[PDB]
Amino acid sequence: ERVGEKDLRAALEWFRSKGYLVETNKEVNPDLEITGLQKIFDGSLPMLFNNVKDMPHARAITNLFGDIRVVEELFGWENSLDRVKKVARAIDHPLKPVIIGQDEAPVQEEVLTTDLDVNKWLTAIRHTPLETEMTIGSGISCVVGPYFDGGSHIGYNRMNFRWGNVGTFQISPGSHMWQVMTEHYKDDEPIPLTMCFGVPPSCTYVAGAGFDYAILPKGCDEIGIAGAIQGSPVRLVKCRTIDAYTLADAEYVLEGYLHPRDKRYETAESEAADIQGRFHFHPEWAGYMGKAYKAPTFHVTAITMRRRESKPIIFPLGVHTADDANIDTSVRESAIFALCERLQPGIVQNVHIPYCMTDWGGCIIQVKKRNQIEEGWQRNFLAAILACSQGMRLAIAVSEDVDIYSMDDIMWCLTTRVNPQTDILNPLPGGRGQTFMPAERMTSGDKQWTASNTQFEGGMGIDATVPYGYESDFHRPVYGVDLVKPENFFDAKDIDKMKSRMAGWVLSLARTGR
């Protein structure tokens, strides 16, 4: 039980071989140093901390998915478009996970069944100095089998263990865990599930997915999609205590039960005066400071991990980082692409969810109309995307002469290609939204800022595409950037001196010439 063929340690070895690994040996605080160093180097190389404060048996990795280029190099993709198409193909073709014995799983070298103090072994962090609680935000849930209709689910859930071996368990309403909890709410037996830590990067990648249930409904095989992404099946193992399955190649696994009707407060102040949605609880995906709520409790029965002499790795990450944004929006991009290809194939060329929009709030699709009969399909695509995403606030459709990765080019399409009377779609006013957007706090009024009181404004679908047959009038003004060579006119020093000053939309426009 010491090999994990494709896991976090092999990924660290590949990162060290490629030269992408930044590793230090100095003792780092989980309090306001890991997330601070992650935000200082946001969207960059992975950082490995060998020594963690008050965690003598644990290492810590961060910014693992921060640069999307090294992630695409890890999984063998050339660019983001190839990544989107390959992960859509992997969604439609899962690899069924294999079950190995309880003696070759590396996560079951040490099995703690007593003295269950989760905060002693797992590294809880604080993100900002405005917080009061150190929370565990590193684990993915793992529901395999009868509670997920014979499929499998992996996904992140934040936990605050402020009762020793009992901690809160934050569930987004509408998610797979919400659907499992809603089905088994009125039950006597609690839901058995495991929280896995230091998982293979494919499992992190698929655990980022969410609110894409027209493509990945309840009963799908998310671990199958992770196995299809890494190109080999993800190994499972039966738990020691509960009746479930874990990722065998993880670094830590918490086994236990979820009690849905046992709801407790996440912080001490919101418990002190009984108010959800007011007190600060570590910044959220929307790009604002989060709020503390009531949440069901996760009753840990066993802590299994690797050997503490091997120093198992945990992956703590801040929420408003490019790390967290890549983790969610990559597989959500390919799911949106899959839905638009299902509705009408051959029209959508590329789907991109930038860091700027949010995890769950926005997307940009790029359509190409081949004839007059395909005119109008972008409005079907925008309405279907906004309806099938639960609280996406802004979907933008652009034409094929646009750089989809530049927000300056998107703003140019918003300025020049949008009729404000006809091209703004508000499809579903009064539907379901995401309560973590404070624009829905503005609709709750003086009631409690919970999901029961918010009112969705309906989303915003912006059709910034060129009408068919008007491609000559909306033609983009390509210059002669390949008809002239600057090496004739200037030397190397003038050329790189002028090239060092360019940044952004000029860098996008100088490649394309438009």
Ligand X SMILES: Cc1cc2c3c(c1C)C(C)(C)C[C@@H](O)N3c1c(nc(O)[nH]c1=O)N2C[C@H](O)[C@H](O)[C@H](O)COP(=O)(O)O
- Single residue of 426, 445, 447, 452 touching a second copy by CB under 8 A: 426
Interaction pattern, residues 144-183, with K ion; x per rule: CB under 5 A: -----------x----------------------------
Q: From CA 502, how far away is CA 410, in angstroms rounded?
A: 19
Sheet holding 22-24, edge to edge: 22-24, 47-49, 59-62, 313-314
- The DSSP code sequence of 26-52 is S-B-TBTTHHHHHHHTTTS--EEES-B
- Single residue of 168, 175, 329, 465 touching Ca ion by CB under 5 A: 329
Radius of gyration of the chain (CA): 24
Interaction pattern, residues 290-329, with ligand X; x per rule: CB under 6 A: ---------------------------x-x----x--xx-
Q: Binding of a second copy at residue 275 (CB under 8 A)?
A: no
Q: Binding of ligand BYC at residue 131 (CB under 6 A)?
A: no
CB 339 within 8 A of CB 90: no
Of 209 and 398, CB closest to ligand X: 209
CB 249 within 8 A of CB 4: yes
Tell me the window of 76-84, 257-265, 329-337, 491-499 that interacts with a second copy (CB under 8 A).
491-499
CB of residue 157 to ligand X, shortest distance in Å: 4
Give the length of the chain. Answer: 514
Query: Could you tell me the CA-to-CA distances from 327 to 127, 179, 209, 221, 470 in Å, in that order?
Result: 18, 22, 8, 18, 38
- Single residue of 353, 384, 386, 425 touching Ca ion by CB under 5 A: 353
CB 329 within 8 A of CB 71: no
CB 344 within 8 A of CB 84: no
Q: Binding of a second copy at residue 394 (CB under 8 A)?
A: yes
CB of residue 180 to ligand BYC, shortest distance in Å: 9
Q: From CA 175, how far away is CA 295, in angstroms rounded?
A: 14
CB of residue 321 to ligand BYC, shortest distance in Å: 10
Decide: helix, strand or coil at residue 146.
Answer: helix
CB of residue 291 to a second copy, shortest distance in Å: 8
Q: From CA 338, how far away is CA 326, in angstroms rounded?
A: 18
Find the helix or strand (DSSP H, E) in which 100 lies: strand 98-100
- Single residue of 188, 309, 446, 489 touching a second copy by CB under 8 A: 489
State the number of CA atoms in the 13 A half-sphere of 375 facing the CB. Answer: 9
Interaction pattern, residues 262-281, with ligand BYC; x per rule: CB under 6 A: -x------------x-----
Residue 423 binding target from Fe ion, ligand X, ligand BYC, none, CB below 5 to 8 Å by type:
Fe ion
CB 262 within 8 A of CB 296: yes
List contacts with ligand BYC (CB under 6 A): 158, 170, 172-173, 178, 181-182, 185, 263, 276, 284-285, 293-294, 319, 324, 328, 359, 435-436, 450-452
List contacts with ligand X (CB under 6 A): 137, 153, 155-158, 170-172, 175-177, 207-210, 317, 319, 324, 327-328
List contacts with Fe ion (CB under 5 A): 153, 155, 176, 222, 417, 423, 463
